[PDB]
Design a protein around this nucleic acid. Sequence first.
RNA 1: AAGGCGGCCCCCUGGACGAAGACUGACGCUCAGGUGCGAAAGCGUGGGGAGCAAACAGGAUUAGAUACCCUGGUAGUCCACGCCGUAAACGAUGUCGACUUGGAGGUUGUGCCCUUGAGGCGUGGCUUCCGGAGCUAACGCGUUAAGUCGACCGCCUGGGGA
Lengths: 151, 55, 117, 56
Amino acid sequence: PRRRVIGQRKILPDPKFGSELLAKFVNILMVDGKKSTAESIVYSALETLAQRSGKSELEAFEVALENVRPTVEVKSRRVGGSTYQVPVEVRPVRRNALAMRWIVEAARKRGDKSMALRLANELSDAAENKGTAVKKREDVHRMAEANKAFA
Amino acid sequence: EIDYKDIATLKNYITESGKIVPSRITGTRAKYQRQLARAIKRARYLSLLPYTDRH
Amino acid sequence: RKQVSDGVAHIHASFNNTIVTITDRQGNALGWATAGGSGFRGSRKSTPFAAQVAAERCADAVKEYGIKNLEVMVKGPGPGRESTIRALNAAGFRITNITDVTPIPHNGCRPPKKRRV
Amino acid sequence: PVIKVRENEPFDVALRRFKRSCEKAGVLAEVRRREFYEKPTTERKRAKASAVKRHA
RNA sequence: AAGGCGGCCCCCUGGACGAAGACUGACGCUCAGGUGCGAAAGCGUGGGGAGCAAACAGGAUUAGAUACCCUGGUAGUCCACGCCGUAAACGAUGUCGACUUGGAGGUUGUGCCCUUGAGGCGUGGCUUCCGGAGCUAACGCGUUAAGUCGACCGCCUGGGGA
Ligand SMILES: [Mg+2]
Ligand SMILES: [Mg+2]
Ligand SMILES: [Mg+2]
Ligand SMILES: [Mg+2]
Ligand SMILES: [Mg+2]
Ligand SMILES: [Mg+2]
Ligand SMILES: [Mg+2]
Ligand SMILES: [Mg+2]
């Protein structure tokens, strides 16, 4: 990415509700190139999440992502031998891209029976902001507010 | 034509901190930038001019 | 304990460390805090983040006197020259006057030999 | 450099006005300069080298 | 003159340069021998000693570390009088004199022209950068010559040994 200024791949919207943001999330949860067994866990965790929170499947995910969505992050830069953490404000597209990534990875580290349960309870713990997914944003906030002078 | 007594003219050739201002910024002739400093120093001694912005 | 309200914020910012001392208008120490005492060492000690947390600790051990307005006085170089003042205003203080009191000789003492590194 | 905070002037601007008063006076300039001893032969070398550099 | 010389003030004092004429009448150049000056360190006697710092001691680094870094620190660095007489004491270019296109500055005199809270035209002393002819092995030097000539003095004659 030195000389080549590339854009970004615009992946097809979700077959169910038609959101491109969800089509990204299914591709995050997808492993070993199995789209059939990936979207099947995401819809099963949407159905069990909206039923035990009060429907609105489009908005019950919107409550869980705003809390895990970061506003600031650090970039390791070796100026004079030493590594200085520079606070950089994340872009709106990359904002959700990391917020979705911390939901899939925290649910993976859970001890529940199935990934439909691991994901549904993680989206429940992020909507109330009391879990592994919101903490990964909290530690990212403490590291950015510390190195606030090298901005 | 320059004098230490003329603390009015002199106050224009010294910084906020008291330091004498170089010929490069003042745009003064070489001969007088010397006559200036000798006078700024002279008045500095006789407490007609400060040394530092601390006092 | 006693009442003061208007004081002076004194900071000795050196390349190695940063000392934050809260004093009155006359020069009597009310309270203090340093980057080394904050629980940092070596590298972490001489950083603007450590100078930030020192001002935070300092404002806490002095608000028992009840200070509202204070005029900052900056001594020396290194990090913590600015980061201390920032952590001071955002903590709950009205900054009256910022002054640089870095000691500058008019060619006096011979300084140590250059480090051959 | 003495900087007095004015009425309805922000802390951000007053700090930025001070950092420019220091830059004007040579606060950190005189420090790095007087940190260690420099021989008369060493400063005469810098003075001659900086004159060569002041030729564009 | 070279070494070198930097807060401000006074006393004593050496040199340089300019303007105008007046005076002396070749009294000049250079110099082996000689004589004087001559950074730093070092030496003697007596003071002084804040900082810095050979030696030294301690702490680290390292395979080792009799170093580089850190913490201390004695001589010395400072004053007086003596001594030493050497440095990459260098422009690595001996002194004096005459002659040979130019460009941009810096510093310091002075003659003049203006309504001037600045400039315009000269004319001397010194200084920096570029460069012409020429010189040079080349790099470069180039009216402040390493050009063109003359006077006198020093000096060189393969490397190591020395
Ligand atoms: Mg006659
Ligand atoms: Mg002695
Ligand atoms: Mg030592
Ligand atoms: Mg002895
Ligand atoms: Mg010899
Ligand atoms: Mg030339
Ligand atoms: Mg030629
Ligand atoms: Mg031989």
